[PDB]
Design a protein around this ligand. Structure first.
Ligand SMILES: *C(=O)N1C[C@H](NOS(=O)(=O)O)C(c2cnco2)=C[C@H]1CN
Length: 538
């Protein structure tokens, strides 16, 4: 009688929000299954089971379909998703069905559904590319009894800690290879529990605000860089994937022209437009290219020296006399055309790279694009044509070759709030079990520029003016707030509508970057931003 070792799948760790609310859970699902070879009389067994587990003709059909499409010596499911009653009836009848096994399988469950799709992700069935990745990473031995895996979001990025440590048992088997005893059991170790910075209530509020728009919202706490909300719409039900998604349902997602499978907050790549002007300003001041008193007269346009090409301001006849304060308040373009010209692409791109543009943010998700912060060498490589001075101008107002993700915008916004201190935007607060609580630790990232210069306050005061002063572009949305809001909007390329904001002005507790593709399906981005800041601050 052979003694056999058999792996035991560990329990997947639990994901909680910042208030201990479970966002991803496990449910046991029971089924009976058999290896037909090990069953003396398959047909006798199948029919006796109609009485015991309510096995149906359809069940037998699916069992036969599955029997063929399977390899020799495979345990074929006979009936799935057994009810409590049905398992009990099978249990008291088990001695009658040697070769039929009743088994419980943990499957993942997402109670809050589409509100958390992109950021939490889902686990679904392992496929061959997962196997490849596990084999290459040297992790495959630990998956001997594991058949599902995180595919995106937190479930994927933290797959290794969520999964746990496979256990095993020694079991005696007789001739025909049926289990008659368990000799020994080394139990698995459950995955670590994971505690996220997210605020579930805030996340669900934002999803409802974004309604039928293609949109992204990133809410962070600038004191920590923790992500309080990361929403991309339209979304979809992650639960669809857990038990294998229908072809009908999955093609429906792929064919949606509103591309709900895209995480727009980390993979949406847009011209950041005027939202960059606070950071360009800080750069120009720090580089000495401008001063708080630098002034030019704006006729509504700006001409490139030694050329006839003109770059227009959004305001037809100009803003008149502009310093940097008033240029931020009114989102003047002309001023920043000049600033770009005087900076040159080398300095401007170098500074914007310090703000994180063009680079990955370091967020703990694996779905992410880096965008593009253009440089001489990049245009040389990408088109094999050199950089002309006219390529620098549009970059000053966040356009040209410049593209960014909303999560990059959030990381830059926080750097301005922290006076050059760089905080990675992250979702992980801590990891638990035993536990043995391990806090997320900020990787060493040198600061930007000089903590002590008053350039940060100057740019931020301009953003305060955007929101509060009567000439500010966002006055209509924010001036009436009790707490003080500072903001900066933008419009890209109907056009995309971007908004960035933080509150309260004095000691910021929340930072928001958001965009409604093509202006959204409902309210304006400024109204939505005020609603989010109102919901948070009350
Ligand atoms: C930046 O993206 N700007 C300048 C300005 N931004 O303001 S807003 O559209 O976000 O409100 C702008 C504008 C103001 N009024 C009409 O357009 C457009 C865009 C021009 N580069």
């Amino acid at each position: 009688n052979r003694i056999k070792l058999v792996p035991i799948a560990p329990s997947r760790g639990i994901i909680y929000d910042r208030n201990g609310i479970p966002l991803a859970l496990n449910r046991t699902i029971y089924q009976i299954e058999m290896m037909p070879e090990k069953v003396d009389n398959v047909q006798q067994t199948l029919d006796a089971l109609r009485s015991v587990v309510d096995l149906t003709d359809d069940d037998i059909a699916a069992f036969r379909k599955e029997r063929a499409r399977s390899h020799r010596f495979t345990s074929i499911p006979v009936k799935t998703n057994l009810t409590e009653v049905q398992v009990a009836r099978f249990a008291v009848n088990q001695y009658r069905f040697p070769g039929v096994e009743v088994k419980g399988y943990k499957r993942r469950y997402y109670p809050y559904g589409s509100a958390l799709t992109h950021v939490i992700g889902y686990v679904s069935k392992i496929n061959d590319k997962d196997v490849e990745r596990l084999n290459n990473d040297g992790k495959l031995a630990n998956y001997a009894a594991t058949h599902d895996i995180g595919k995106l979001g937190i479930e994927r990025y933290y797959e290794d800690v969520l999964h746990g440590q496979t256990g095993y048992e020694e079991v005696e088997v007789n001739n025909r290879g049926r289990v008659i005893r368990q000799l020994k059991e080394v139990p698995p170790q459950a995955g670590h529990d994971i505690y996220l910075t997210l605020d579930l209530k805030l996340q669900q509020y934002i999803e409802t605000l974004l309604a039928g728009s293609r949109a992204a919202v990133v809410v962070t706490d600038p004191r920590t860089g923790g992500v309080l909300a990361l929403v991309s719409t339209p979304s979809y039900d992650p639960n669809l994937f857990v038990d294998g998604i229908s072809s009908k349902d999955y093609s429906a997602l792929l064919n949606d022209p509103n591309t709900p499978l895209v995480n727009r907050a980390t993979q949406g790549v847009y011209p950041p437009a005027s939202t960059v002007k606070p950071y360009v300003a800080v750069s120009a001041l720090s580089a000495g290219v401008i001063t708080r008193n630098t002034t030019l007269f704006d006729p509504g346009w700006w001409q490139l020296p030694g050329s006839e090409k003109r770059y227009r301001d959004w305001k037809k006849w100009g803003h008149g006399r502009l310093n940097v304060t008033r240029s931020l308040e009114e989102s003047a373009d002309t001023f920043f055309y000049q600033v770009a010209y005087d900076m040159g692409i080398d300095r401007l791109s170098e500074w914007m790279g310090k703000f994180g543009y063009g680079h990955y943010t370091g967020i703990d998700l694996a779905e992410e694009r880096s965008g593009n912060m253009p440089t001489r060498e990049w245009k040389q490589k990408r088109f094999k044509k050199p950089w002309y001075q006219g390529d620098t101008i549009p970059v000053g107002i966040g356009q040209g070759y410049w593209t960014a993700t909303p999560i990059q915008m959030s990381k830059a916004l926080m750097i301005l709030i922290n006076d050059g201190i760089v905080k990675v935007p992250h979702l992980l607060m801590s990891t638990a079990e035993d536990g043995k609580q391990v806090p997320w630790v900020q990787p060493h990232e040198p600061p930007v520029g000089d903590i002590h210069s008053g350039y940060w306050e100057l740019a931020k005061d301009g953003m305060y003016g955007v929101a509060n002063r009567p000439n500010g572009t966002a006055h209509k949305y924010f001036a009436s707030a009790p707490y003080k809001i500072a903001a900066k909007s933008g419009t890209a390329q109907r056009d995309h509508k971007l908004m960035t904001a933080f509150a309260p002005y004095n000691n910021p507790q929340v930072a928001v970057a958001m965009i409604l593709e093509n202006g959204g399906a409902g309210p304006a981005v400024g109204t939505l931003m005020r609603q989010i800041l109102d919901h948070i601050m009350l």
